[PDB]
Amino acid sequence: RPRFSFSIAAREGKARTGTIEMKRGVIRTPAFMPVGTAATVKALKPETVRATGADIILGNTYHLMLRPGAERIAKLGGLHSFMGWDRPILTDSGGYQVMSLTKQSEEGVTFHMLSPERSIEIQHLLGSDIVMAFDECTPYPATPSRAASSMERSMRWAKRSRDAFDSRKEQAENAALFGIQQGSVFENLRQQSADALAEIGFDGYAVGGLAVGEGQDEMFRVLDFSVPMLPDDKPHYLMGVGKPDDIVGAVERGIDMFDCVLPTRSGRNGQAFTWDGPINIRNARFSEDLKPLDSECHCAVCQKWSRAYIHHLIRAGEILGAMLMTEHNIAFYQQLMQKIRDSISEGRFSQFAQDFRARYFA
Template identity: 70%
Template sequence: MSNRFDFMIHATDGNARTGQIQMLRGATRTPAFMPVGTAATVKAMKPETVRKTGADIILGNTYHLMLRPGAERVARLGGLHKFMNWDRPILTDSGGYQVMSLSDLRKLTEQGVEFRSHIDGAKHMLTPERSMEIQRLLGSDIVMAFDECPRADQSREVIAASMEMSMRWARRSRDGFDTGGEHAERSALFGIQQGALDEELRKRSADALTDIGFDGYAIGGLAVGEGQEAMFATLDFAPGQLPADRPRYLMGVGKPDDLVGAVERGVDMFDCVLPSRSGRNGQAFTWNGPINLRNARFAEDQEPLDNRCACDTCATYSRAYIHHLVKSSEILGAILMTEHNIAFYQQLMQAMRDAIAAGQFAQFAQYFRQDYLRQ
């Protein structure tokens, strides 16, 4: 076993898989949910609290960190792990999603993307080579290839041209990563499949990525407004187009029932801002579905957020107290709600890992949906 990157599948049940990614900074159990630490912080959470929820790996963002505090500064301060006090694996998003979301502030060419900072309006150029350099300076363990993420409602011609350019950028990302010296020798590079909802375009993308060769493969261009039914229809074929012996990462997903449906279809890794963003806005995820703590019905409810949750928030605080904090816009409300939501997501991932290992994933998924979607 190499210390740099190994992926082991321990059990399968239908298309669902459970296993482990082993890297120098530790093991990541799969299926895995990565809390999002966009700007070197999972909002409202200390890193040690994130780890206590059961998270093995977190995500940082190339675009945001390159603008503030700056990749070179992070490198001078010892790298992202030391900077934010997280000693386990970090995956960094390449900035491609922000390229899509900044369509009014960007100029897209074959070379890369010229854009103005949303912070101060300063001009920047982000290319595959620069994205690799930034992620090297940050010291990330899993580096994402630079890509463009087109909207699913664009024409097939536009989506195809975008996918083909992303594959050329994937080749340049591979070349740029491989020149990264010591960082390249101890980290991993993932390619990103594109093609929107089109099966043939996704197959062409998967074949191009496989020819280049990556440590893992992401499914990009979903969860961008197409709806769960269309996303699942795409996941019925997209994971199977990617190498079976490598981890498959569905980017930017999602709601708890999205995760269950995607694992059912062969996905191994996820990230999403939803549990932390929802926590800051008064929504808690529970085994019986999401609840809004702003609702007056919780004002005198002395039950925990979720009787089946083992997190510190549920062990210590009542819905009534958290309702008061949320309604009063107290910072502690966001802290407690985010801790619960991140912990719930990690408990969900562990439950799925256990069900796959026991050969009972179909039963688990059925009972989960009955409870979670019954409202």
């Protein structure tokens, strides 16, 4: 079992499909990572997360470093053992969220003090498989001079992340490290950032600082020039994205990995994803609808329960409502990724994207 091996099996335009082999399992790409806020993917057992097709989850670090604490989780055997997920876990670096949810210096972020060295050690203690570099959160909007300052600090922090990771033998031998490109919406800064990260060298490269309110057109415009700046032979990870159409468009532009809270969070709020677009199951029109949430979905929820029942559960505030909506939405996201992988493999992803959009927005 390799530490980290990315292999591209097929291409179509800028889109790629393939695999990342790691010690704890294989990740099929393009990949969607369910988000686990506080050592749980909300309302799902890990076996259910796996049953939906997920190969890897994202563990939020910002929450866990406070309570229970990274040292405590390590004492209890690590995050995998703690939460009962034995496959790869990507951990975010914590500083971004802290600033997003503070006082910044060259040393790190104060809120307690979080430094790039401390971030890597926390992720080490959690037993992370994919470690993110410690980066800074750029405000949006931001002046070129302001985005440049943040990006450059992030690049210096990326070097320190690299060194801290490399100094930890167990981590360097068993885990992978991703750098995070910054530079807001500006092409020249995205280039300098890419250049800096490539000079350092990482196992994978994330596009950070997007989905911060710029809108899809702008996000896509930024991806258009930003993704080709990254090393072609390494995975490309778009952080915090997104809606199904965001994902399809991002894959068309060379992205291999995704995470976002939308399927879980909007699931609990009554929004279900379908191939004909999102529906809100609380709507009165579903009160006697015996069809499943989606007519084609292969998930366990759509095999057994009706829209009418789930409508009732969510309106009654029942936990099982949240459970069923969440399992379906995560499964829908995984079936989307599977359709993306198959269509790229088969050289018909362009047609899939067109067919998908025509029906989803009909």
